[PDB]
Amino acid sequence: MIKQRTLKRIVQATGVGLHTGKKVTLTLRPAPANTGVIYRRTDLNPPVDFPADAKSVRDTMLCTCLVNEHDVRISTVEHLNAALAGLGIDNIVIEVNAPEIPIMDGSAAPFVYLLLDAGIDELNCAKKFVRIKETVRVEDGDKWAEFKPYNGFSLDFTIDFNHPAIDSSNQRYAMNFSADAFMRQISRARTFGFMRDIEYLQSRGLCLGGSFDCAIVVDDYRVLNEDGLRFEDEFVRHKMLDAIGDLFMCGHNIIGAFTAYKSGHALNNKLLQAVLAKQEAWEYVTFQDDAELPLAFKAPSA
Amino acid sequence: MIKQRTLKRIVQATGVGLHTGKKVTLTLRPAPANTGVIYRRTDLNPPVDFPADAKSVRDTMLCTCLVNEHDVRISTVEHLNAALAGLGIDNIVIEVNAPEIPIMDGSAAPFVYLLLDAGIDELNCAKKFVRIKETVRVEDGDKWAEFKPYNGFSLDFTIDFNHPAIDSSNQRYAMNFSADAFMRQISRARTFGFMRDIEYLQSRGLCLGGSFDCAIVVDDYRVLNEDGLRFEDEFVRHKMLDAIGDLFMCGHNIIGAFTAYKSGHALNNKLLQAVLAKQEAWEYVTFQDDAELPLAFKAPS
Amino acid sequence: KEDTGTVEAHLTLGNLFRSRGEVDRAIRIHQTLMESASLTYEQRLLAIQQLGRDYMAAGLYDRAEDMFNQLTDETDFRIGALQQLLQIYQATSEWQKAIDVAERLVKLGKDKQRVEIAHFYCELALQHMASDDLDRAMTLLKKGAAADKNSARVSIMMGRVFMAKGEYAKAVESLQRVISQDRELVSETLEMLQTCYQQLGKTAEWAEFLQRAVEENTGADAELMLADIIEARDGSEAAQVYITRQLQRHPTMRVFHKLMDYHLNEAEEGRAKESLMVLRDMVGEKVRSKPRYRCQKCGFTAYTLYWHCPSCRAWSTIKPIRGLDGL
Amino acid sequence: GTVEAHLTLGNLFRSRGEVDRAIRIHQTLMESASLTYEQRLLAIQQLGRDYMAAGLYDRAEDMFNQLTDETDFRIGALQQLLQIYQATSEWQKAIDVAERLVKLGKDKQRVEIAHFYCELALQHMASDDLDRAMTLLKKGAAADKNSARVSIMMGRVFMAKGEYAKAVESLQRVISQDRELVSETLEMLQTCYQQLGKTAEWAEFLQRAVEENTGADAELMLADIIEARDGSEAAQVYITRQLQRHPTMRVFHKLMDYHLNEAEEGRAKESLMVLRDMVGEKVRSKPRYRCQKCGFTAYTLYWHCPSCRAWSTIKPIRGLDGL
Ligand SMILES: CCCCCCCCCCC[C@@H](O)CC(=O)O[C@@H]1[C@@H](N)[C@@H](OP(=O)(O)OP(=O)(O)OC[C@H]2O[C@@H](n3ccc(=O)[nH]c3=O)[C@H](O)[C@@H]2O)O[C@H](CO)[C@H]1O
Ligand SMILES: CCCCCCCCCCC[C@@H](O)CC(=O)O[C@@H]1[C@@H](N)[C@@H](OP(=O)(O)OP(=O)(O)OC[C@H]2O[C@@H](n3ccc(=O)[nH]c3=O)[C@H](O)[C@@H]2O)O[C@H](CO)[C@H]1O
Ligand SMILES: [Zn+2]
Ligand SMILES: [Zn+2]
Ligand SMILES: [Zn+2]
Ligand SMILES: [Zn+2]
Structure with a gap:
């Protein structure tokens, strides 16, 4: 039944945002079954949870960028999303303390490495x-x-x-x-x-x-x-x-x-x-x- | 003492001269002890030989190019010489049917490959x-x-x-x-x-x-x-x-x-x-x- | 690597060794794998192709030909092997075999390699012309034109050989075809078309052709030639209108230089002359500095028309540079 | 050797981009207990390079911080840490790393220390904290006296505060520090010589700058002032002289503009008008500042060249192209 998946450990990585150039600290965290990928700005007052949904995208200049009603944004989520799709992650909480996902080497290989290092645990529930x-x-x-x-x-x-x-x-x-x-x-x-x-x-x-x-x-x-x-x-x-x-x-x-x-x-x-x-x-x-x-x-x- | 070296098999290689663009069929051939590296042109009906002497180099615009008194030239001998010096070959007859040692990939690695494939012998004579x-x-x-x-x-x-x-x-x-x-x-x-x-x-x-x-x-x-x-x-x-x-x-x-x-x-x-x-x-x-x-x-x- | 398995691991290791330049080790690995008695036909063909590419990247060309001639008859690798052999025969300056391989490839379906056939035939004709034999050069040019009929080089070479033979009428007949064969290269024939028409003496038709060329946006060369003939035909000041009109539609450094020269020829002297001197000494100081021909595949710039661009080794790519920079 | 069999497969994997495998190989080698001290340090350096290539800067920093105490690797580790701290917009630590590198012999890092201090001042500037901005710029000047950015930033800070005498005094130092960048000061300098009220010294300085082949901007400004002073004729004469001595497309356009004002109406004037319509477009389309190490042409002065990431290598393009 394929089964849903998530991470095993809170895995972090610093980087330089591609479209802002600001130091960012990506922090992938596990979530229970039936949570969906929810992005989260952590430097803001409370946090600003962006439940992954096609309607959230409101700026696509050169980076699929989430934007909630208050203009709080998380840009360049294309490559991290690609990595999660590659490993089939359905429940994971992505936290960035700066308004963009890091770029790493401009591909999804670093994100694949981070996710594998965390470990892809499988939960007991069907995958939608x-x-x-x-x-x-x-x-x-x-x-x-x-x-x-x-x-x-x-x-x-x-x-x-x-x-x-x-x-x-x-x-x-x-x-x-x-x-x-x-x-x-x-x-x-x-x-x-x-x-x-x-x-x-x-x-x-x-x-x-x-x-x-x-x-x-x-x-x-x-x-x-x-x-x-x-x-x-x-x-x-x-x-x-x-x-x-x-x-x-x-x-x-x-x-x-x-x-x-x-x-x-x-x-x-x-x-x-x-x-x-x-x-x-x-x-x-x-x-x-x-x-x-x-x-x-x-x-x-050898 | 270090012994003189030559090749064990005649080895050919067809390349393109860098400074002429012609197709040169370089051929390295063994020689007996105490002969020195001698370059040679083969397309010329009377075969013409250049003994390796510093005075032979007469045109050096962009490549050490041997020239005898009659203006017969073998240009770009500065890479094959490099390989021979690296492997320490003391007696070898180099033949080119066109007026340039080929360039191969630019470096001297192909010439080392050719010489090693030929196999380097060790004559029973002292190396000067x-x-x-x-x-x-x-x-x-x-x-x-x-x-x-x-x-x-x-x-x-x-x-x-x-x-x-x-x-x-x-x-x-x-x-x-x-x-x-x-x-x-x-x-x-x-x-x-x-x-x-x-x-x-x-x-x-x-x-x-x-x-x-x-x-x-x-x-x-x-x-x-x-x-x-x-x-x-x-x-x-x-x-x-x-x-x-x-x-x-x-x-x-x-x-x-x-x-x-x-x-x-x-x-x-x-x-x-x-x-x-x-x-x-x-x-x-x-x-x-x-x-x-x-x-x-x-x-x- | 050496931890990726076998056979294919050997191929990847050899590819890495060739890329790093350690040519001897690349050939050693590929040849050791090829001599293995446990290989299948597909793997043996793969090994032979890799060995041929190794020899070609190491410069040993005849060994590359030997290791590539064994893949032409194989359906899987036929096109690639023929392409590599065509490259070898281009580099080693053997035009006849290159033409044969190009004909094989065009018969196989790749019709893009007809311009290259025309260029090889033109190169052979140039080799013959170097020995003062116009008949064989004409024969090779005719064969090349039959191979491809959309090559400006064939027409230009035919014009050159005709001018050598003195059949100036045929020289014009061949050269003018470049107008329909390739517009961007029209400027290359004017230097010789002028001589042809002068020998024929059809000055009126020469002016008519120049007018057609300029109306067809051929380049600054045609405009300058037409203005030069017009100046003598109907005076300078009275006939300066034409250069002014052609200027407005297609301004170029090489054109306004002539207008500045005309102003200098008839001026009121004084400060205006000093200006129109210091300028017209600067536009003319970057009319000759700027490159005139550019390759539209790799950016190579040169002062002469290289048919075979040195950088990318692509035939019929270097063309005159148009727009406030030259022809 | 067996160990060198690793750290060469790992380098290959990193080059191919499979960081997931290069990092794995180097980490497995490091975790082995058979590694000697020197081999362990080599493995640490390779793993740090793997992380830096993969873009996980927080881990590359951690790995490289283990080599700053080893004599052989101190230069490499400190240089990599400097690159990491430059990349992730952290200057207060890049300055520390660069100063350690200077103390360890490399004396060409004073330029980058001055630039880090200037960047910190820029951060404190634009937030109306000009006092700390000036303090940081003074520190940067102390760390290097041959930096034009420090002088220009100090001029900007003085202008914002209002002290214009000190502004001009600091700005004029660019001629002694780097002549090529003098064209940057002129614009700003002009203001501090106008509202200050010393027009005669402004004209004299412009004349000196022009005589020192300062550039096309200085020549154009001198021509404009000479025009406003002594009519268009003297300005045209001077522009012609400078064009003959120093040819530049911008001065050519200025000469065309001055010619247009003095020309009898005719189709020749319309031809000159179209020539202007083309040449002005070309000059406005050509790049102004070019890098002298990677051939990057930008329309505005970049202190940190985006391509080669080398400081103070973008200078105005000189010749018939632009300035
Ligand atoms: C489309 C693309 C197609 C392919 C084209 C790529 C190349 C393939 C064609 C063959 C080219 C070859 O020819 C190799 C080639 O070009 O390299 C030669 C090289 N051998 C050497 O030549 P040479 O010893 O005669 O020195 P020059 O006087 O000519 O150098 C002038 C000035 O250089 C200074 N100088 C000179 C010598 C030295 O030791 N140190 C040093 O600083 C000094 O200031 C002097 O005044 O120097 C130059 C350095 O690459 C080149 O000329
Ligand atoms: C000096 C030192 C430099 C250091 C490093 C610099 C580089 C840093 C990395 C980020 C660079 C960014 O600049 C991203 C970057 O370059 O890649 C984007 C790329 N994604 C895509 O654009 P994208 O889909 O995002 O968005 P647009 O709405 O703009 O696409 C519609 C427009 O693009 C055309 N189009 C689009 C797609 C296609 O298949 N074909 C095609 O023609 C279409 O005709 C229309 O004109 O197309 C372009 C292709 O590179 C870039 O814009
Ligand atoms: Zn992308
Ligand atoms: Zn050399
Ligand atoms: Zn090209
Ligand atoms: Zn640069």
Whole structure:
């Protein structure tokens, strides 16, 4: 019955926010069964609990950012959400004492490491799944996203940046979602960004904490990172990582086929809201995806 | 005493000359004891031979390039010489059917691979080293090279390229020369050029065969190669590789301390000619250098 | 690694060794795995491909060809092996075999490699022209044009060989085709089209073609040539209107330089002359400094038209730079 | 060796981005009881680098704090701690680490100490705490006398307080500290020479700055004042002289603007108008400040270059591009 999951220990990690550049102290904590991922601002008077819900998203400039009625915000929850979806965490309390989830290395690998270090305990209760009965679709001009019925969770992303440094790489990716598949193929894709649009973005108040150590700074004609790309086509891989993170905002893993072309955070959130609006287009189910089983590997001593 | 070495099998390799762009079918062949490395051109119906003597180097615009009296040239012999010096080959006939030793990947690693695949023999004859006796120094303005007496071969090269891409790496590297040390540290640094002056050099008849696959191309501010630098300070390491290759032009492994600053391919050859011109500065000796035996250590999990 | 299993672990270790530059160890690992008697056909082909890539990255080209010629007949690796062989035959300057491999690849479906066939044929014709043999150069140019009919290099080379032979009418016939074959490279033919028309003596048709070229937005070269001929045709001051009009639609440094020169030629002297001197000494001091041709795949900038861009090694990518910077 | 078999697989895994595996390998090696002291320190350093690459700064700091007492690793550990404290906007500790590094020999960290003090002052500035801002800037000046940021910040603080004589006295030091950045002071300096009331000294200083090839901004300001003083003719003469001696697109646009005012109406004037419409757009579109270590071009002065993260390496672009 798949069974719900949570953490075993209160696991912390400091970082530098990508879109604010302020020191942040992420503190993942366990929760009982039937709690859902609830984000929490802790530096505020009382706390400001943001129950993960597609409607909370109200700012999608370059980071799916929660905003309650009082303008208290927690930005850049895309990658942490992607990690939680990868490990299938349904009950976890995320606390940040600064108004944004840290960035770590610009991917979900650090968050996967933190969650695994905490340990994925399994609770005694069925795991709620959002199964897509009827095909739904949303469009934003030349960008579009589409949810289709499926006996699983499959993603199919395409990008087109008309950029000499990104077109050379693979521009289409597709997979059947699974804990091991996510951990091995998508958890490492970095936060690709262009060097030309940094002066402007930093002026506007975004990407104040981004540096070569947490992004693929692509200049006008080539990737500027010394190491290079972790994957030969990690731009689309990271875009699908952001897609998983955005789609997890509903609080539960989704069952369906998600096909996207040039989708962003705004489009993914709009698609999720559209699906959740049609009461007949989605239903609650259990035991539809083969998550878990993060197989270990040999540890030779030499 | 250290024994002279040659190859056990004739070994071929077809590459592209860096400074000509032609297809060169390099062929390394063994020679008997007491013959010295001799370069040779094969496309010429009468085969023409260049004995390895410092005086042979006559054009050094960007690469130590042998030239005889009739203007028959074998350019870019500064990397193959580097590999031979690293492995201490004393008798070998190098043949090229086009006027340039190939460049391979820019470094001297492919030549070490070719020589090791050929297999290095040990002739039953003494190995002549050219050991220095008196300090000899030559300067070309700011650039200066210096040989000092020493019980071995030790290089202390330096570089001062006023360029943001080369100034962030150690502009100094010193090592105690030895076959294993050479094969491990210096025998992979690639030839590095600037993309700013490639439109010009190719117009002057140089760097025609160059490309990202056989050089480190540092643009105005950073290294453009997708792989990146093999080391952290590959530039000085390759400059010292060129230094070893150029110093090998005397035909024998040299013994001493070679300290250089901004030394090119002309200054090294000038230093070698000056050293060999003084009869009281150098002498032929035997068995005075560190081990030249490669170590097959790598065997991890 | 060495803890990821076998065979595939060997392949990953060899790839890492090649990337780090330790070429000898990469070949040693790949060859040891290939010589293993416990490998399957698919694994042997994978090993041979990796060994060929190792040799190619180490510069030993004939060994790379030997290790890649064994994958062309294999369905899985045919296209990749042929691509690598095409790269080898490009680098080692063997144009005929490169053409043969490109024809194989185009027969296999990849139709993008027809421009490269035309360029290889043009390179062979250039080699022949270096030995003063125009007939064979024309034959190779005709074959290349038959291979691809949307290559400006073939037309320019045909014009060059015709001018060498003296068939100037055919030289014009071939050169003018570049207008329809590729607009961005029109400026390359004007230097020779002028000579062709001068030898033919059809000055009126030369002016007509220049007018058409400028109306078609060919570049600053056509505008300058047309203005130069007009100055002699119908005076300077009276005919300065045309340069002014062409200026407004497509202003460029190379154009206003001529207008400043015209102002200098007929001026009222005094402070205005001193100004129009200090300027017209500066626009002209960055008209020659700025690069004229740029590669639209890797940003390479050069003062001459490199058909084979040195950086990315892509054929027919360097084109004139347009907009307040040159042609 | 067996130990060196680890710390090379771990480095590979970290480079590939699989921090979950590199950290695991290094931690397992560290937990082993067979590690010698030096090997244990090497493992600690590798684990700290793993954490820093993965972005878990609170753990990289903890790991690197175990190496500051070991003679061999003191430089590396302190440098990594400085990078961590710069990254996570914590300057009051970055200053301590940099001062320890200075005491341990590295004398090129005085610039970064001055910049940390300036950043702290900036934090205390904008909250109307100018007294502590000035105190911190004075400390930074004491830690380095060859920093232009300290002088400019002190000028700003004096201007906010109101003491303009001291403002000009401090601002003028930029010429002796770093000439390339003098163009930054001019704007501010102008105000402190206008409301102060010393116009003659302002003109004299502008003339001196121009003669010292200060830049295009100084030349333009000098041309404007010469115009307002002695008519447009003298201004045009001076601008022509400076353009011939020092060519800059901005001065070229100024010369075009002065030419337009003196020109008989005609289609030539309209051609000059369109030339202005293009050249002014180009000059307003070109970058102003460029970094001298990574080729980053920004339209406003960045003290901490975003790309190479090196302090005080962004200087005004000099030549035919901009200033
Ligand atoms: C100097 C030292 C520098 C140090 C480090 C700097 C970097 C730091 C890391 C963060 C950088 C950020 O800057 C994030 C960053 O660069 O990535 C975002 C990325 N997510 C996505 O944008 P996103 O979906 O968030 O939001 P938009 O509403 O803007 O998307 C709609 C708009 O984007 C176009 N679009 C969108 C998606 C697609 O598939 N194709 C495509 O064309 C679409 O045509 C329209 O124009 O597209 C862009 C692709 O990198 C960026 O904006
Ligand atoms: C599209 C991309 C296609 C691929 C292009 C990439 C390259 C492949 C093509 C082959 C290029 C080769 O040729 C390698 C190449 O370019 O590197 C040569 C290199 N050997 C050496 O050459 P050389 O010894 O003759 O010195 P120069 O006088 O020429 O150097 C001038 C000034 O440099 C200072 N200086 C000089 C020497 C020294 O020891 N120290 C030092 O500081 C000194 O101030 C002097 O005045 O110096 C330079 C350093 O890379 C280059 O010239
Ligand atoms: Zn993202
Ligand atoms: Zn070299
Ligand atoms: Zn290119
Ligand atoms: Zn910088």
